[PDB]
Design an enzyme around this catalytic site. Structure first.
Site, PDB file in Angstrom:
ATOM      1  N   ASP A 121       0.848  -1.203   0.000  1.00  0.00           N
ATOM      2  CA  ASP A 121       0.000   0.000   0.000  1.00  0.00           C
ATOM      3  C   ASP A 121       0.875   1.242   0.000  1.00  0.00           C
ATOM      4  OD1 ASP A 121      -2.339   1.699   0.070  1.00  0.00           O
ATOM      5  OD2 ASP A 121      -3.140   0.618   1.764  1.00  0.00           O
ATOM      6  N   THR A 159      -7.039   3.163  -2.014  1.00  0.00           N
ATOM      7  CA  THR A 159      -6.668   1.784  -1.740  1.00  0.00           C
ATOM      8  C   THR A 159      -7.708   0.789  -2.197  1.00  0.00           C
ATOM      9  OG1 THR A 159      -4.823   2.080  -0.165  1.00  0.00           O
ATOM     10  CG2 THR A 159      -6.230   0.093   0.099  1.00  0.00           C
ATOM     11  N   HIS A 420      -3.306  10.520  -0.910  1.00  0.00           N
ATOM     12  CA  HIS A 420      -3.418  10.095  -2.274  1.00  0.00           C
ATOM     13  C   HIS A 420      -4.872  10.050  -2.624  1.00  0.00           C
ATOM     14  CE1 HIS A 420      -4.983   6.308  -0.791  1.00  0.00           C
ATOM     15  NE2 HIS A 420      -4.060   6.402   0.145  1.00  0.00           N
ATOM     16  N   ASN A 685     -25.034   7.959 -22.639  1.00  0.00           N
ATOM     17  CA  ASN A 685     -25.265   7.283 -21.353  1.00  0.00           C
ATOM     18  C   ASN A 685     -23.965   7.076 -20.550  1.00  0.00           C
ATOM     19  OD1 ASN A 685     -24.057   5.296 -22.742  1.00  0.00           O
ATOM     20  ND2 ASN A 685     -25.715   3.821 -22.529  1.00  0.00           N
ATOM     21  N   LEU A 689     -18.907   3.334 -24.036  1.00  0.00           N
ATOM     22  CA  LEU A 689     -19.166   2.418 -25.128  1.00  0.00           C
ATOM     23  C   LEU A 689     -19.962   3.125 -26.211  1.00  0.00           C
ATOM     24  CD1 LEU A 689     -20.371  -0.716 -23.166  1.00  0.00           C
ATOM     25  CD2 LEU A 689     -18.075  -0.274 -24.039  1.00  0.00           C
ATOM     26  N   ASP A 691     -22.607   4.475 -28.542  1.00  0.00           N
ATOM     27  CA  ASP A 691     -24.075   4.527 -28.592  1.00  0.00           C
ATOM     28  C   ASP A 691     -24.660   3.993 -29.887  1.00  0.00           C
ATOM     29  OD1 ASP A 691     -23.886   5.911 -26.220  1.00  0.00           O
ATOM     30  OD2 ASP A 691     -24.725   7.788 -27.033  1.00  0.00           O
TER      31      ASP A 691
HETATM   32  C1  LIG Z   1     -15.189  -3.061 -18.721  1.00  0.00           C
HETATM   33  O1  LIG Z   1     -15.435  -4.472 -18.737  1.00  0.00           O
HETATM   34  C2  LIG Z   1     -16.718  -4.800 -18.225  1.00  0.00           C
HETATM   35  C3  LIG Z   1     -16.878  -6.321 -18.152  1.00  0.00           C
HETATM   36  O2  LIG Z   1     -16.743  -6.862 -19.476  1.00  0.00           O
HETATM   37  C4  LIG Z   1     -17.787  -4.182 -19.106  1.00  0.00           C
HETATM   38  O3  LIG Z   1     -19.021  -4.282 -18.371  1.00  0.00           O
HETATM   39  C5  LIG Z   1     -19.971  -5.156 -18.976  1.00  0.00           C
HETATM   40  O4  LIG Z   1     -20.659  -4.485 -20.026  1.00  0.00           O
HETATM   41  C6  LIG Z   1     -21.796  -5.130 -20.629  1.00  0.00           C
HETATM   42  C7  LIG Z   1     -22.504  -4.122 -21.571  1.00  0.00           C
HETATM   43  O5  LIG Z   1     -22.787  -2.835 -20.945  1.00  0.00           O
HETATM   44  C8  LIG Z   1     -22.779  -5.651 -19.566  1.00  0.00           C
HETATM   45  O6  LIG Z   1     -23.788  -6.459 -20.218  1.00  0.00           O
HETATM   46  C9  LIG Z   1     -25.131  -6.310 -19.660  1.00  0.00           C
HETATM   47  O7  LIG Z   1     -25.373  -7.240 -18.587  1.00  0.00           O
HETATM   48  C10 LIG Z   1     -26.689  -7.231 -18.001  1.00  0.00           C
HETATM   49  C11 LIG Z   1     -26.774  -8.276 -16.884  1.00  0.00           C
HETATM   50  O8  LIG Z   1     -25.623  -8.125 -16.041  1.00  0.00           O
HETATM   51  C12 LIG Z   1     -25.619  -8.936 -14.839  1.00  0.00           C
HETATM   52  O9  LIG Z   1     -24.829 -10.141 -14.944  1.00  0.00           O
HETATM   53  C13 LIG Z   1     -23.402  -9.945 -15.075  1.00  0.00           C
HETATM   54  C14 LIG Z   1     -22.725 -11.300 -15.396  1.00  0.00           C
HETATM   55  O10 LIG Z   1     -22.319 -12.073 -14.252  1.00  0.00           O
HETATM   56  C15 LIG Z   1     -22.891  -9.162 -13.834  1.00  0.00           C
HETATM   57  O11 LIG Z   1     -21.479  -8.881 -13.857  1.00  0.00           O
HETATM   58  C16 LIG Z   1     -23.628  -7.815 -13.721  1.00  0.00           C
HETATM   59  O12 LIG Z   1     -23.155  -7.058 -12.572  1.00  0.00           O
HETATM   60  C17 LIG Z   1     -23.417  -5.618 -12.618  1.00  0.00           C
HETATM   61  O13 LIG Z   1     -24.480  -5.173 -11.770  1.00  0.00           O
HETATM   62  C18 LIG Z   1     -24.276  -5.401 -10.363  1.00  0.00           C
HETATM   63  C19 LIG Z   1     -25.334  -4.600  -9.630  1.00  0.00           C
HETATM   64  O14 LIG Z   1     -26.572  -5.287  -9.780  1.00  0.00           O
HETATM   65  C20 LIG Z   1     -22.904  -4.996  -9.803  1.00  0.00           C
HETATM   66  O15 LIG Z   1     -22.595  -5.816  -8.673  1.00  0.00           O
HETATM   67  C21 LIG Z   1     -21.734  -5.133 -10.774  1.00  0.00           C
HETATM   68  O16 LIG Z   1     -20.699  -4.239 -10.304  1.00  0.00           O
HETATM   69  C22 LIG Z   1     -22.172  -4.813 -12.215  1.00  0.00           C
HETATM   70  O17 LIG Z   1     -22.493  -3.410 -12.256  1.00  0.00           O
HETATM   71  C23 LIG Z   1     -21.923  -2.710 -13.365  1.00  0.00           C
HETATM   72  O18 LIG Z   1     -22.518  -3.127 -14.614  1.00  0.00           O
HETATM   73  C24 LIG Z   1     -23.918  -2.771 -14.796  1.00  0.00           C
HETATM   74  C25 LIG Z   1     -24.467  -3.328 -16.124  1.00  0.00           C
HETATM   75  O19 LIG Z   1     -24.599  -4.761 -16.077  1.00  0.00           O
HETATM   76  C26 LIG Z   1     -24.045  -1.239 -14.691  1.00  0.00           C
HETATM   77  O20 LIG Z   1     -25.385  -0.791 -14.933  1.00  0.00           O
HETATM   78  C27 LIG Z   1     -23.545  -0.756 -13.318  1.00  0.00           C
HETATM   79  O21 LIG Z   1     -23.584   0.673 -13.249  1.00  0.00           O
HETATM   80  C28 LIG Z   1     -22.108  -1.221 -13.046  1.00  0.00           C
HETATM   81  O22 LIG Z   1     -21.205  -0.425 -13.815  1.00  0.00           O
HETATM   82  C29 LIG Z   1     -25.154  -8.026 -13.681  1.00  0.00           C
HETATM   83  O23 LIG Z   1     -25.553  -8.553 -12.404  1.00  0.00           O
HETATM   84  C30 LIG Z   1     -27.731  -7.511 -19.089  1.00  0.00           C
HETATM   85  O24 LIG Z   1     -29.038  -7.574 -18.492  1.00  0.00           O
HETATM   86  C31 LIG Z   1     -27.630  -6.458 -20.207  1.00  0.00           C
HETATM   87  O25 LIG Z   1     -28.638  -6.729 -21.227  1.00  0.00           O
HETATM   88  C32 LIG Z   1     -29.480  -5.625 -21.737  1.00  0.00           C
HETATM   89  O26 LIG Z   1     -28.928  -4.926 -22.890  1.00  0.00           O
HETATM   90  C33 LIG Z   1     -28.861  -5.804 -24.040  1.00  0.00           C
HETATM   91  C34 LIG Z   1     -27.890  -5.341 -25.132  1.00  0.00           C
HETATM   92  O27 LIG Z   1     -27.262  -6.506 -25.717  1.00  0.00           O
HETATM   93  C35 LIG Z   1     -30.277  -6.034 -24.576  1.00  0.00           C
HETATM   94  O28 LIG Z   1     -30.255  -6.847 -25.766  1.00  0.00           O
HETATM   95  C36 LIG Z   1     -31.118  -6.729 -23.500  1.00  0.00           C
HETATM   96  O29 LIG Z   1     -32.491  -6.612 -23.934  1.00  0.00           O
HETATM   97  C37 LIG Z   1     -30.908  -6.170 -22.063  1.00  0.00           C
HETATM   98  O30 LIG Z   1     -31.895  -5.130 -21.876  1.00  0.00           O
HETATM   99  C38 LIG Z   1     -32.838  -5.299 -20.781  1.00  0.00           C
HETATM  100  O31 LIG Z   1     -32.500  -4.516 -19.614  1.00  0.00           O
HETATM  101  C39 LIG Z   1     -32.410  -3.089 -19.864  1.00  0.00           C
HETATM  102  C40 LIG Z   1     -31.809  -2.337 -18.665  1.00  0.00           C
HETATM  103  O32 LIG Z   1     -32.478  -2.649 -17.432  1.00  0.00           O
HETATM  104  C41 LIG Z   1     -33.804  -2.608 -20.288  1.00  0.00           C
HETATM  105  O33 LIG Z   1     -33.844  -1.209 -20.591  1.00  0.00           O
HETATM  106  C42 LIG Z   1     -34.241  -3.369 -21.540  1.00  0.00           C
HETATM  107  O34 LIG Z   1     -35.489  -2.840 -22.015  1.00  0.00           O
HETATM  108  C43 LIG Z   1     -34.236  -4.889 -21.257  1.00  0.00           C
HETATM  109  O35 LIG Z   1     -35.181  -5.300 -20.251  1.00  0.00           O
HETATM  110  C44 LIG Z   1     -26.183  -6.473 -20.768  1.00  0.00           C
HETATM  111  O36 LIG Z   1     -25.866  -7.679 -21.492  1.00  0.00           O
HETATM  112  C45 LIG Z   1     -22.054  -6.394 -18.430  1.00  0.00           C
HETATM  113  O37 LIG Z   1     -22.943  -6.664 -17.337  1.00  0.00           O
HETATM  114  C46 LIG Z   1     -20.919  -5.548 -17.859  1.00  0.00           C
HETATM  115  N1  LIG Z   1     -20.169  -6.236 -16.819  1.00  0.00           N
HETATM  116  C47 LIG Z   1     -19.701  -5.651 -15.693  1.00  0.00           C
HETATM  117  C48 LIG Z   1     -18.947  -6.550 -14.746  1.00  0.00           C
HETATM  118  O38 LIG Z   1     -19.863  -4.472 -15.410  1.00  0.00           O
HETATM  119  C49 LIG Z   1     -17.530  -2.726 -19.420  1.00  0.00           C
HETATM  120  O39 LIG Z   1     -18.424  -2.353 -20.475  1.00  0.00           O
HETATM  121  C50 LIG Z   1     -16.073  -2.458 -19.780  1.00  0.00           C
HETATM  122  N2  LIG Z   1     -15.858  -1.028 -19.806  1.00  0.00           N
HETATM  123  C51 LIG Z   1     -15.430  -0.364 -20.902  1.00  0.00           C
HETATM  124  C52 LIG Z   1     -15.273   1.131 -20.778  1.00  0.00           C
HETATM  125  O40 LIG Z   1     -15.176  -0.920 -21.955  1.00  0.00           O
HETATM  126 CA   LIG Z   2     -22.655   4.727 -24.651  1.00  0.00          CA
HETATM  127 ZN   LIG Z   3      -3.605   5.642   2.251  1.00  0.00          ZN
END
Ligand SMILES: *[C@@H]1O[C@H](CO)[C@@H](O[C@@H]2O[C@H](CO)[C@@H](O[C@@H]3O[C@H](CO[C@H]4O[C@H](CO)[C@@H](O)[C@H](O[C@H]5O[C@H](CO)[C@@H](O)[C@H](O)[C@@H]5O[C@H]5O[C@H](CO)[C@@H](O)[C@H](O)[C@@H]5O)[C@@H]4O)[C@@H](O)[C@H](O[C@H]4O[C@H](CO)[C@@H](O)[C@H](O)[C@@H]4O[C@H]4O[C@H](CO)[C@@H](O)[C@H](O)[C@@H]4O)[C@@H]3O)[C@H](O)[C@H]2NC(C)=O)[C@H](O)[C@H]1NC(C)=O
Ligand SMILES: [Ca+2]
Ligand SMILES: [Zn+2]
Ligand SMILES: O=C(c1cc(OCC2CCOCC2)nc(C2CC2)c1)N1CC2=C(C1)CN(C(=O)N1CCc3c(O)noc3C1)C2
Ligand SMILES: [Cl-]
Ligand SMILES: [K+]
Ligand code: NA
Length: 805
Positions: A121, A159, A420, A685, A689, A691
């Site tokens: 750390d 951290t 930091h 949004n 990624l 739009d």
């Molecule tokens: C960095 O790398 C990461 C990892 O690769 C990238 O993040 C991924 O991006 C994907 C695209 O945005 C995303 O895919 C979506 O997943 C949805 C289900 O996700 C759940 O399951 C996964 C798998 O185990 C899990 O990891 C998720 O965990 C998230 O949420 C919990 C909180 O509940 C947190 O504990 C966790 O930290 C994480 O949160 C983060 O991600 C979410 C998004 O999932 C953010 O909103 C948070 O702010 C936070 O940052 C989940 O538990 C899935 O449902 C999505 O599907 C919708 O969209 C598709 C498009 O293909 C569409 O076809 C479908 O119809 C569907 O839509 C439906 O729901 C809509 C919204 O409610 C609704 O409007 C519609 O009408 C429909 O009903 C989608 O596939 C993936 O989950 C994340 N993974 C992670 C770990 O974040 C990231 O993009 C990279 N970053 C960069 C800059 O490149």
């Molecule tokens: Ca976007």
């Molecule tokens: Zn410190």
């Protein structure tokens, strides 16, 4: 409830946890106040200290001792780490010359080299040079193994966000741990350093390394140590775990040191009191390496020495107070310190307005040591917006400063001289990476890299398939002797059309005009060849970018530039052009000031129009290939094509014009030509990624011309600057930016001055990696070079930071 009356006899530092109300004996039980009654007596022995002495050699085993110097200790796996040095005439690991580890030299029954992650750390990068006289074990690792001059933490450089980024490969916005302190409105809960809520699993997203290992049948040593468990005991526990039978022995281990962060807060990063904590971390490393050597594991195990962030000089008198800016200072909650996060104190207050708070914090004092942002306007390189836990309003605080709400918060809580959390490009926040072992290279320096890349490597080191993450898998293949992951270019999803002349001038009713009615077979075949792509090898040096999603687009060739024009968004997705060292800047002639021309290769219906710009009183327009850099008066007409046009607020055009008129030429001069790829970005949004059309929140009024949130450029040249950009035989050099497309210049407090006093500083702030641009555009760059794909991936992760040495 915990029935703490069971026992730890035979269970000291057990690898599976056990469920309440059964009492616990693992390395975390203290932190849950759930250890069995006899845990300290049996599991935390301290008798006689941590080192063998001459008189202890050969001894009668006494089980009360912390570690053993008896003859059976190697077989028991519980000798003091210095046992062989003292009692068997062996040398300390640090004293031995270093010898290349060409293959893992492991005991029988080891299926793979173990991985040991030694995390420190607050270990600021420059400690490697500045503390080198007092850290000989660490310096051996560093110079015999693979090392980077520094590793870039993620923002905020706190951290917990960084340790969990190390664990997951994810940005804090994706993993959830967006600060050391947090409020989640959906949960209606808060996460603090002190307390129990942080142990609840719902804070922690993604898939950390220990879970990735477990699911794929690799056994993990428990990564976390309760703070009371001393360092020497953590080492002995790891060494004992390494003596377990093949079927019970973990493959990955973690050690975490609270130092030197703990002292650096008190004494500053280079305070004289800092020498001792560095000595002590080095001694601990010494113990580990001497321990591994005894177990004949020192040419078998891969050891990672990695920090979470650095440390900066910060004192209480360098605090800005929001009470010296805001009247309504009781209606806000501030998450304070080296960054600022502001929300409403009460959600039943409808009189709360973020707009007015931001304006009250914007450029109010001449020397101001923070800058407010709506989170979506933060520099895209920070990737700090797409989480409900990140407050809409954010303050980026200058290095060396704090922000607080009121002065009572500072004195009713000077104590600290170090902190930091600042912007992750800041030098003092940089941290360390060293990899030593059979799988890492021998005596190799690698370029600086970001800590989000390490999850993939640790997975590679254990033969695991990484869960989806923000690393670019392959970008760190150059750290590894073997176990490399061989990535392939993503497949192009949409192929372009190559339209020719299909439309007559009169079919267009765009409301555009141009003074271009001025008329030779020598220069008529020539211009035909330019429209068919004769000069394309000049302007498109690395192949055309690949479109990685389904869409409709046209490649358009011109004398000076090439574009991939989108029929869906009515503008280029990318414009590519090359500006040599010798090229000249001209002005837009007067007669062509307002010139926009129909493109006879593209239908009226897939074209912008000038009328919308006339009717939109906020929105003006600019060009992606700049008219200033036209190669001839004749070629300049191409730059006024409607297909080169993009929407721009007047305030943004000041930035853009200065970049195109002055900075491109300056960069060409300095870098011996440059290739430039520029284009629009849509991220309404703020998820980092690309739009889809249906996510666009703003159009040029009365039209389907969508408004970008940002404009990018990728500026490439030859790393060997004695070769011009268009004839480079070796590695490439790149800098990029993602400029926010904003209707004002409130971000730049000196914007009423000349562009030469602020534009470039702004661009620097918004420096970006090519990879950031890829995510935001769905494009894949550098498809056709002579360079290996690994080297290109490394290039795509590069960030030009504009800090000094
Ligand atoms: C960095 O790398 C990461 C990892 O690769 C990238 O993040 C991924 O991006 C994907 C695209 O945005 C995303 O895919 C979506 O997943 C949805 C289900 O996700 C759940 O399951 C996964 C798998 O185990 C899990 O990891 C998720 O965990 C998230 O949420 C919990 C909180 O509940 C947190 O504990 C966790 O930290 C994480 O949160 C983060 O991600 C979410 C998004 O999932 C953010 O909103 C948070 O702010 C936070 O940052 C989940 O538990 C899935 O449902 C999505 O599907 C919708 O969209 C598709 C498009 O293909 C569409 O076809 C479908 O119809 C569907 O839509 C439906 O729901 C809509 C919204 O409610 C609704 O409007 C519609 O009408 C429909 O009903 C989608 O596939 C993936 O989950 C994340 N993974 C992670 C770990 O974040 C990231 O993009 C990279 N970053 C960069 C800059 O490149
Ligand atoms: Ca976007
Ligand atoms: Zn410190
Ligand atoms: O064991 C861990 C740990 C260790 C850990 O390794 C993850 C490894 C993943 C693989 O790559 C190497 C790292 N991952 C976690 C969390 C993410 C899952 C935790 N602890 C951390 C902390 C303590 C012990 C105590 N504590 C403080 O005293 N401060 C709280 C934070 C803080 C600050 O910001 N400045 O001072 C302080 C003081 C922070
Ligand atoms: Cl925080
Ligand atoms: K206008
Ligand atoms: Na301004």
């Amino acid at each position: 409830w915990t029935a703490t009356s069971g026992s730890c006899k035979g269970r000291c530092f057990e690898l599976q946890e056990v469920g309440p109300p059964d009492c616990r004996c693992d390395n975390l039980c203290k932190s849950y106040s759930s250890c069995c009654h006899d845990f300290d007596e049996l599991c935390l022995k301290t008798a006689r200290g941590w080192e063998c002495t001459k008189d202890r050699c050969g001894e009668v085993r006494n089980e009360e001792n912390a570690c053993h110097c008896s003859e059976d200790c190697l077989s028991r796996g519980d000798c003091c780490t210095n046992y062989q040095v003292v009692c068997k005439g062996e040398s300390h690991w640090v004293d031995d010359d270093c010898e290349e580890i060409k293959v893992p030299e492991c005991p029988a029954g080891f299926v793979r080299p173990p991985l040991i992650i030694f995390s420190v750390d607050g270990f600021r990068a420059s400690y490697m040079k500045k503390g080198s006289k007092v850290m000989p074990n660490i310096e051996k690792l560093r110079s015999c193994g693979t090392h980077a001059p520094y590793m870039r933490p993620v923002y905020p450089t706190k951290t917990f966000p960084n340790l969990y980024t190390l664990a997951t490969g994810l940005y804090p916005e994706s993993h959830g741990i967006v600060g050391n302190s947090m409020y989640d409105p959906v949960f209606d809960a808060s996460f603090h350093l002190r307390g129990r809520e942080k142990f609840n699993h719902r804070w922690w997203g993604g898939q950390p390394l220990w879970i990735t290992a477990t699911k794929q049948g690799v056994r993990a040593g428990t990564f976390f140590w309760s703070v009371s468990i001393p360092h020497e005991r953590r080492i002995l526990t790891i060494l004992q775990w390494l003596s377990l039978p093949d079927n019970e022995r973990p493959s990955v281990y973690a050690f975490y040191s609270e130092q030197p962060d703990f002292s650096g807060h008190k004494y500053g990063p280079f305070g004289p009191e800092m020498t001792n904590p560095l000595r002590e971390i080095d001694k601990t490393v010494g113990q580990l390496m001497d321990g591994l050597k005894q177990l004949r594991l020192h040419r078998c195990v891969n050891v990672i020495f990695v920090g979470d962030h650095g440390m900066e000089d910060v004192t209480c008198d360098r605090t800005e107070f929001l009470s010296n800016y805001l009247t309504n200072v009781d209606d806000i909650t501030l998450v304070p310190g080296t960054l600022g996060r502001i929300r409403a104190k009460s959600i039943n207050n409808s009189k709360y307005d973020p707009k007015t708070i931001i304006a009250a914090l914007t450029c109010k004092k001449p020397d101001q040591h923070f800058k407010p942002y709506m989170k979506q306007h933060l520099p895209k390189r920070l990737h700090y917006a797409n989480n409900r836990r990140i407050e809409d309003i954010h303050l980026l605080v200058d290095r060396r400063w704090h922000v607080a709400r009121k002065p009572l918060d500072v004195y009713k809580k000077c104590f600290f001289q170090g902190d930091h959390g600042f912007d992750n490009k800041v030098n003092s926040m940089q941290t360390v990476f060293v990899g030593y072992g059979p799988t890492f290279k021998y005596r190799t320096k690698v370029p600086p890299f970001e800590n989000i890349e390490l999850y993939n490597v640790m997975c590679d080191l254990l033969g695991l398939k990484p869960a989806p993450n923000n690393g670019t898998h392959g970008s760190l293949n150059h750290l590894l002797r073997t176990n490399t992951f061989r990535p392939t270019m993503p497949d192009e999803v949409s192929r372009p059309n190559y339209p020719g002349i299909m439309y007559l001038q009169s079919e267009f009713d765009l409301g555009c005009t141009c003074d271009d009615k001025v008329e030779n077979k020598l220069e008529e075949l020539n211009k035909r060849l330019h429209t068919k792509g004769s000069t394309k090898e000049r302007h498109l040096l690395y192949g055309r970018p690949a479109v990685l999603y389904r869409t409709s687009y046209d490649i358009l060739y011109h004398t000076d530039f090439e574009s991939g024009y989108s029929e869906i968004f009515l503008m280029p997705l990318w414009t590519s052009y090359t500006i040599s060292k010798q090229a000249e800047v001209s002005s837009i002639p007067e007669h062509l000031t307002n010139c926009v021309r129909p493109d006879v290769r593209v239908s009226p219906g897939f074209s912008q129009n000038c009328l919308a710009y006339k009717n939109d009183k906020q929105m003006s327009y600019g060009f992606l290939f700049p008219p200033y850099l036209s190669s001839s008066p004749e070629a300049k007409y191409d730059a006024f094509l409607v297909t080169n046009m993009v929407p721009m607020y007047p305030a943004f055009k000041r930035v853009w014009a200065y970049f195109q008129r002055v900075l491109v030429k300056k960069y060409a001069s300095e870098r011996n030509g440059v290739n430039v790829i520029s284009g629009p970005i849509f991220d309404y949004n703020y998820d980092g990624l690309r739009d889809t059309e249906d996510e666009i929140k703003q159009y040029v009024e009365g039209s389907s011309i969508p408004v970008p949130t940002h404009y990018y450029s990728i500026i490439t040249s030859c790393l060997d600057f004695t070769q011009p950009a268009d004839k480079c035989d070796g590695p490439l050099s790149v800098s990029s930016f993602i400029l926010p497309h904003r209707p004002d210049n409130d971000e730049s407090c000196n914007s009423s001055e000349d562009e030469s006093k602020w534009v470039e500083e702004l661009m620097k702030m918004h420096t970006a990696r090519v990879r950031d641009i890829e995510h935001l555009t769905g494009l894949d760059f550098y498809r056709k070079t002579s360079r290996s794909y690994s080297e290109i991936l490394t290039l795509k992760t590069y960030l030009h930071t504009y800090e000094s040495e």
